[PDB]
Amino acid sequence: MKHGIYYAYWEQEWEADYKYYIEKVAKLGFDILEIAASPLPFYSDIQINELKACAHGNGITLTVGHGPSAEQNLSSPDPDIRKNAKAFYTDLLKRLYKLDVHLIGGALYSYWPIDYTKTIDKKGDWERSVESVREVAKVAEACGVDFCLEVLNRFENYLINTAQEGVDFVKQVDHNNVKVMLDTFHMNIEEDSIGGAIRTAGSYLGHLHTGECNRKVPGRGRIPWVEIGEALADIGYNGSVVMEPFVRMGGTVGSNIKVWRDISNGADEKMLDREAQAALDFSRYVLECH
Amino acid sequence: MKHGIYYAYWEQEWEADYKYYIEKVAKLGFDILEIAASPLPFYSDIQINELKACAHGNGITLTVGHGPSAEQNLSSPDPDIRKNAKAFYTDLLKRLYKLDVHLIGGALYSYWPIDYTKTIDKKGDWERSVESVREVAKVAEACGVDFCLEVLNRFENYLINTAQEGVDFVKQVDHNNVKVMLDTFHMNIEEDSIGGAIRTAGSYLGHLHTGECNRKVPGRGRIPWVEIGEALADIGYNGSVVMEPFVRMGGTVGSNIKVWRDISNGADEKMLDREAQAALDFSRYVLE
Amino acid sequence: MKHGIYYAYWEQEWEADYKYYIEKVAKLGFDILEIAASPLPFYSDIQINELKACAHGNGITLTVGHGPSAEQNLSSPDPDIRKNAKAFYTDLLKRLYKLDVHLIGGALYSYWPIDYTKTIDKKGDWERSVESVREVAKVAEACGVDFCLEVLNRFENYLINTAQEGVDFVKQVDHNNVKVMLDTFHMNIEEDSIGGAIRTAGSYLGHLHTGECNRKVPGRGRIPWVEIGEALADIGYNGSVVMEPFVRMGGTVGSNIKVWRDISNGADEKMLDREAQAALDFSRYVLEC
Amino acid sequence: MKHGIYYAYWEQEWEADYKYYIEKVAKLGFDILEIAASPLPFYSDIQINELKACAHGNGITLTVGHGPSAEQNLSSPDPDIRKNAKAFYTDLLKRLYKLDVHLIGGALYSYWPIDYTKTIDKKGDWERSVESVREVAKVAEACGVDFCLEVLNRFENYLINTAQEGVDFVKQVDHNNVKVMLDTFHMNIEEDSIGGAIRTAGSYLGHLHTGECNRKVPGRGRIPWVEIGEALADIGYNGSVVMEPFVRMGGTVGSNIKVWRDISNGADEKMLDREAQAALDFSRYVLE
Ligand SMILES: O=C(CO)[C@@H](O)[C@H](O)[C@H](O)CO
Ligand SMILES: O=C(CO)[C@@H](O)[C@H](O)[C@H](O)CO
Ligand SMILES: O=C(CO)[C@@H](O)[C@H](O)[C@H](O)CO
Ligand SMILES: O=C(CO)[C@@H](O)[C@H](O)[C@H](O)CO
Ligand SMILES: [Mn+2]
Ligand SMILES: [Mn+2]
Ligand SMILES: [Mn+2]
Ligand SMILES: [Mn+2]
Ligand SMILES: [Mn+2]
Ligand SMILES: [Mn+2]
Ligand SMILES: [Mn+2]
Ligand SMILES: [Mn+2]
């Protein structure tokens, strides 16, 4: 497996100097840095090429996460939003192609976080979504990009909350490059079984996010990491595992993730770095070759 | 310890004929029925007495749960909202005393569920709430009621998310009738240690809600029940334990709890009855 | 799934008035009573029909457990011990048939408990055992009995300590009536994964013993019961599940099981019955479907 | 917190060239090397100073483990055996003082492994042992050595099988240089609660052995490491943590520990080294 970490562990907005983080995680021993998609549509060609060259020169692979805006909601009942959305993704996937990125994940079938003050139509949203994802998927394939649909807890989305729902949705889409994506923090809430959910995902699992129950770095909390490693070995998971810790208050990240206390316990950057590296060593040790 | 269940397990709105449920759970074997406070202020003085009568007749003890509305938000920066909130609690609490209820719990220090659309001010809300709660505490003490502050996960509230934050708030309130309340569903998300959180609550723990990670009845999910039982013995817990399963879609309950799939797996009322009864045997066995 | 309990939970010797426990256990709600095989060769056909009819009357299914003596050692290098051993099971299995018992289990490929002051030849004992068991297995087929080979921890046996070893031994024996048997107390010591060991057992699993890490009744300890239910479901286990708690010091049972403190904490018979009943409610709830 | 490993992980007999292992574990990053006491009584005085020189040279602290032989049984009903036992330990402890080691642990109140084809007189053995250990304690105190009594599973000892029995024994001995010692492999069998056993030992815990359920190195097994680390933090443990993995068949070690299958799966020295270092990183990280 290839191990990565989301840059947002160090930042409070959905954008940053990704080159700085590529240099950092390469020194910490990671294989991957996952970056937020938000700023990419504003990258000039030379900026995309420099980012790509940076990743390549440092032996780092870039993956992309995206929490879509309501205006990029592929499941919208408004035909215009669905059109703006497909247009947004099309342009984004081409940028990913130029970046040599082959994976994007997150609530790509909806938007995030969900504004629950608006009325919900799961059934209706579900079918518009399946349709929209079907065609975005075709652009993704032409770009060499796997489009991973992340199963989320109920407080963050209502369409896909369990691995079974994720598999159902992905089978309906029925496209080779559209995958299910799990996240230990979300599984921790919705699943009857962690290993079971992973085996349920099976051949459809295309990406995995890690973090403790309250989103600390993997290892020192209650997530059943050994059971997870066993299940990944049962399904022959080949993919990437990207830890996504959020331990700092503040900014759009703190607000969207809902960090209302200093979970980092006053850590400075170097401290954060050390904990992520210990967490990487732990992940490689516990999660592999079971 | 005394075991109960929240009536909402069977209903989709924050009210119901509580008499029908006092008889149901008395039969199923529960010692307690927990009821939503919402419809109570619309109970006449006579309706109160028959509810109480109905409870005493069935050997069932009544506890109350309450997810406050924005207008009952004791943490509010708006003095008129705070004023109305103290009035609601004082009226609600006098009714509780006449109903012969000695415990109310929920996000009593705030409102539920939070609309994260508005602007949050944790620091200021926290100070206002501590003060408003201490006042309300005098009334709760009078009506012989335990004002229980429930620690909730980050998605449903931002003031108190861990047992440690709960104990800090309660110690700040510094009042006899205010307790910390824990819920296995919420602890499962926010805590480093389930047993550790319970031990942190210690003597301040006044009420406990149970449910699996995804809110099914206690037993066949991933919650560490043995560890909870051992930690309650460590602190010598002598309160009640109320299961709060939510396995049904629809209504204000389904929307507030966020049940977007049929977790009950098509259960009918009898099937719901059986599972709750089995979870009750399980809880008395494992937890004590 | 059918749920039972070992009568020994109440007794300190490997024999007892099984009719008394058949009645007790029917009132507590079990579907099965497991009895020790050692007193059965001393039973007349009258006692065998007596026991069978009584089980039948209280609706209880009977299963058998046996910790073989050194003289009943099917793996012994001494060919006379092996001949006497085969004679012993040949007789026993015919009695089981008369009792309409379709399952016996324990360290049937060896003897129990092992005396480590002796000489070990795991490789040698293993080969002799596979040979003897396959033979006994024909007699088992004939008597309609499932010969279950229990995987034990290292302190009690050295031949088969993990589900994988148990599976290798059974595959090698290669006979329909031989199955692997697992016990949560033994898996707790030896296995890397509990769900994994069950799954490795797979279709070869023919019997399951349960108890907490320190042998108390199932449920209030550290054994991962939910994980066990899942794995039993993953392999579609239909067999029975028998709790085998040991919480009392004294006697052969106490010395053989090595109970050196009062784990029951003063439990009198009624208290023991209460906990077994609660543990049985727990097992049906957590372990099934 | 100091972390070590028992040298027997790489050897099949209760002795070896400890200098070779001091260099190896310093290179892998350990703080401590734990050695078997067995060969030490017979160390010339030169060999004692060389061993100590090496340890200091490599920045390694040495701790000692010991499975006493039947003739060294301080609990024996036989007075000549108790006499020898006491002479054995006073000589061993004085050497330890020379070797500059401050900790010895194991079934020091008895002998190991127990021969169960003999008569078990628990109450009598227990009384004699408490009295004997108390005497030895005085010498241990003079040599600046913590005499740690290890709690073992039922198959390896019958006097002390739980943390509660270990604490009861140590409190009866009533001497500051005598401590309780826990081992995750042994707790995994006997305890109701791992965290609970650690909290029961509390201030009395003077040493801790680690290993997976089946004695593989810590990390990929079922032992609840986070719970252990949280309980060590609960009591404020000021001792060391020594992993005692046993993954190889053969010799006195393989038969005393009862390894009947190749648990190491063909590992050569280099592979045993890497797995030890990975478990060390895991332990420092998870146990805090
Ligand atoms: O689990 C999550 C969100 O809770 C991740 O998918 C990521 O943070 C999100 O997609 C926004 O970047
Ligand atoms: O756990 C919670 C909310 O998740 C409850 O205690 C809440 O106050 C109650 O559900 C309101 O009806
Ligand atoms: O678990 C075991 C032994 O520890 C049993 O299966 C044994 O065969 C039985 O207890 C003998 O009576
Ligand atoms: O855990 C134990 C024995 O199972 C050890 O501490 C023992 O004292 C040592 O292994 C002997 O060398
Ligand atoms: Mn995620
Ligand atoms: Mn931490
Ligand atoms: Mn922690
Ligand atoms: Mn609750
Ligand atoms: Mn057994
Ligand atoms: Mn008990
Ligand atoms: Mn040890
Ligand atoms: Mn217990």
Domain boundaries, given as residue ranges, for chain B: 1-288
**Is residue C202 helix, strand or coil?**
helix
Length of chain B: 288
**Exposure pattern of D145-168 as b/e (b: 16+ CB <10 Å)?**
bbbbbbbbbbbbbbbbbbbbbbbb
Dist CA A147 CA A109 (whole Å): 10
Q: Give the architecture-level CATH label for domain A1-290.
A: Alpha-Beta Barrel (3.20)
**Exposure pattern of C193-211 as b/e (b: 16+ CB <10 Å)?**
bbbbbbbbbeebbbbbbbb
- Chain D hits for A279, Cβ within 8 Å: 285
Q: Is the peptide bond before A113 cis (omega within 30 degrees of 0)?
A: yes
Query: Kindly report the CA angle at D239 between D233 and D241, in degrees rounded to 5?
Result: 90
The token pair at B166 is 């709960």
The token pair at C267 is 């439990």
The DSSP secondary structure of chain B, one letter per residue, reads -EEEEEGGGT-SSS---HHHHHHHHHHHT-SEEEEESTTGGG--HHHHHHHHHHHHHTT-EEEEE----GGG-TT-SSHHHHHHHHHHHHHHHHHHHHHT--EEEESTTS-SS--TTS---HHHHHHHHHHHHHHHHHHHHHTT-EEEEE---TTT-SS--SHHHHHHHHHHHT-TTEEEEEEHHHHHHH-S-HHHHHHHHGGGEEEEEE--TTSPPTTSSS--HHHHHHHHHHHT--SEEEE------SHHHHHHHT--S-TT-S--HHHHHHHHHHHHHHHHHHH-
**Which single residue is written with the structure tokens 């030849």?**
C121
Question: Ligand 3 within 6 A of C106 CB?
Answer: yes
Contact C109, C151 (CB under 8 A): no
The DSSP secondary structure of A93-109, one letter per residue, reads HHHHHHHT--EEEESTT
Contact D242, D280 (CB under 8 A): no
C-alpha C11: how far from chain center:
16
**Is residue C169 helix, strand or coil?**
helix
Which of D272, D223, A144, A266 has its CA nearest to residue C222? D223
The token pair at B37 is 């406070």
**Which single residue is written with the structure tokens 């920045």?**
D59
**Which single residue is written with the structure tokens 């000039």?**
A44
Chains in touch with C (≥3 Cβ pairs < 8 A): A, B, D
Contact D137, D174 (CB under 8 A): no
Dist CA D84 CA B163 (whole Å): 56
Q: What is the CATH number of domain D1-288?
A: 3.20.20.150
In this structure, what is the dihedral angle of CA atoms B257, B262, B263, B268, given to the nearest 10 degrees?
110
Neighbours of D123 (CB within 10 A): 8
Ligand 1: list residues with CB < 6 Å: A 36, 65, 67, 106, 112, 150, 156, 183, 209, 244
The amino acid at residue C191 is E
Contact D159, D133 (CB under 8 A): no
The partner residue sitting opposite A213, judged by closest CB among B155, B189, B259, is B189
Question: Ligand 4 within 6 A of D218 CB?
Answer: no
Helices and strands in chain D: count of H runs, count of E runs = 10, 8
**Which single residue is written with the structure tokens 């929240």?**
B6
The token pair at B22 is 């006092």
Dist CA D137 CA D175 (whole Å): 7
Residues pairing with A179 in the sheet: A148
CA distances from A148 to A85, A173, A233 (A): 17, 12, 20
B6 Cα: distance to centroid of ligand 2 (angstroms): 10
Dist CA D142 CA D152 (whole Å): 27
Dist CA C111 CA A112 (whole Å): 63
C-alpha B211: how far from chain center:
12
Query: Kindly report the CA angle at C226 between C225 and C231, in degrees rounded to 5?
Result: 95
What DSSP designation does D120 have?
A: -
Which of B48, B49, B1, B4 has its CA nearest to residue B26? B4
Q: Confirm whether residue C18 is marked as ligand binding.
A: no
Question: Ligand 3 within 6 A of C112 CB?
Answer: yes
In this structure, what is the dihedral angle of CA atoms A172, A178, A180, A185, given to the nearest 10 degrees?
-130
Q: Which residues contact D258 (CB under 8 A, 6 or more apart)?
A: C116, C154, C155, C158
The DSSP secondary structure of B39-91, one letter per residue, reads TGGG--HHHHHHHHHHHHHTT-EEEEE----GGG-TT-SSHHHHHHHHHHHHH
Contact C244, C6 (CB under 8 A): yes
Query: Kindly report the CA angle at B130 between B124 and B133, in degrees rounded to 5?
Result: 130
**Is residue D7 helix, strand or coil?**
helix
Q: What is the CATH number of domain C1-289?
A: 3.20.20.150
C-alpha B49: how far from chain center:
23
CB interface of A with C, residues 213-242, below 8 Å: 226-227, 230
Task: Please report the resolution in angstroms.
Answer: 2.0
Instruction: Return the axis-axis angle of helices C269-287 and C225-234, rounded to nearest 10°.
Output: 50
The amino acid at residue B242 is V
Question: Ligand 3 within 6 A of C67 CB?
Answer: yes
CA atoms within 13 A on the CB side of B50: 9
Dist CA D7 CA D18 (whole Å): 7
**Which single residue is written with the structure tokens 């269940």?**
B5
Helices (H), chain D: 18-28, 45-57, 79-99, 122-142, 163-173, 184-190, 194-201, 225-235, 251-257, 269-287
Catalytic residue among D150, D191, D212, D275: D150
Instruction: Return the axis-axis angle of helices A79-99 and A122-142, rounded to nearest 10°.
Output: 30
Indicate if C230 belongs to the active site.
no
Q: Is the peptide bond before C77 cis (omega within 30 degrees of 0)?
A: no
C-alpha C216: how far from chain center:
16
CA distances from A66 to A49, A137, A247, D192 (A): 21, 15, 19, 46
Residues pairing with B65 in the sheet: B36, B105
Dist CA B168 CA B146 (whole Å): 18
The token pair at D279 is 């478990």
CA distances from A32 to A4, A28, A57, A228 (A): 4, 11, 13, 20
Which of C177, C22, C31, C40 has its CA nearest to residue C99? C40
The token pair at B87 is 């009035």
Contact A160, A152 (CB under 8 A): yes
Query: Kindly report the CA angle at B273 between B267 and B275, in degrees rounded to 5?
Result: 75
Way it was determined: X-ray
**Which single residue is written with the structure tokens 């319970």?**
B198
Neighbours of A271 (CB within 10 A): 12
Q: Is B43 near chain C, with CB under 8 Å?
A: no
Which of D34, D137, D144 has its CA nearest to residue D95? D144
Q: Is A194 near chain B, with CB under 8 Å?
A: yes
Dist CA B150 CA B108 (whole Å): 8
Dist CA B32 CA B29 (whole Å): 9
Indicate if D150 belongs to the active site.
yes
